[PDB]
Design a protein around this ligand. Structure first.
Ligand SMILES: *[P@](=O)(CCCN=[N+]=[N-])OCCCCCCCCCCCCCCCC
Length: 247
């Protein structure tokens, strides 16, 4: 990985109480989208790990070299960091961060609870792009930022490698097929007007998981990047309530 990490894309750690929260940012995104959550959780006395996914926060040419196994490894590392100083671990994530949240819970039953936010397990737009017939460039122009608050700017790549999109699709496929192995408590956030990840994904995750304790909280004044959007304080308040309930 050959480019410098952008300002605001650095990983974030905090060693506080014996209860830990792993925060996973999204595809082409940076820890910048999860930072206000991580700080709010850290102030509440929680040990937080906000890792920077491999190939992210630098340059899109760096991400092109990475597989989803790399992104998983970045999260498994954060999970291992939390596992060495916590006995109870929650995982939360936005978009693909939500996908990796689900992925982790499918492999680690010790997860006390998960809080996916606009998690993606099925994006029909990807399949639609490679059946168009036309030539498919090596790098595609990224989808515009999906935020209701106009004063907020997201830290994400201007371009998206085709190879990375294929890696994302494979991750979502393996994640969606293994949903029934999640039994831990789940707090699913979903924006009604998500223009990137179809809101129906929350339904798929809800019906897929074997968790007896699951709930869908619907965000009404936020687009895709809800964690920076208007419903940020609500997400924080609900999550802390969720954490304290199962800690
Ligand atoms: P989340 O992972 C990101 C949220 C925070 N990160 N940021 N910013 O969003 C899920 C990613 C899904 C994006 C897919 C949209 C691309 C559709 C266009 C596809 C055209 C090219 C596809 C052909 C490749 C086979």
């Amino acid at each position: 990985e050959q480019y410098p990490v952008l300002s605001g894309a650095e990983p974030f750690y905090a060693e506080n109480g014996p209860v830990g929260v792993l925060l996973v940012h999204g595809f082409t995104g940076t820890p910048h989208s999860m930072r206000p959550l991580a700080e709010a959780y850290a102030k509440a006395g929680y040990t937080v790990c906000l890792p920077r996914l491999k190939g992210h926060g630098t340059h899109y040419e760096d991400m092109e070299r990475t597989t989803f196994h790399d992104w998983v490894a970045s999260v498994e590392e954060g999970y291992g960091w939390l596992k060495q100083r916590c006995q109870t671990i929650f995982v939360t994530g936005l978009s693909m961060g939500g996908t990796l949240t689900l992925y982790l819970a499918e492999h680690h039953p010790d997860i006390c609870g998960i809080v996916p936010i606009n998690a993606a397990v099925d994006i029909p737009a990807i399949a639609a792009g490679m059946t168009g017939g036309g030539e498919l460039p090596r790098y595609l122009d990224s989808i515009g930022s999906d935020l209701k608050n106009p004063d907020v700017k997201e830290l994400a790549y201007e371009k998206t490698p085709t190879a990375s999109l294929l890696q994302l699709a494979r991750l979502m496929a393996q994640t969606k097929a293994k949903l029934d192995r999640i039994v831990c408590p789940a707090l699913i956030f979903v924006s009604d007007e998500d223009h990137v990840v179809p809101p129906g994904n929350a339904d798929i995750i809800f019906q897929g998981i074997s968790s007896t304790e699951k709930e869908i909280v619907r965000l009404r004044n936020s687009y895709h990047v809800a964690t920076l959007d208007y419903d940020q304080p609500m997400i924080i308040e609900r999550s802390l309530e969720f954490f304290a309930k199962h800690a």
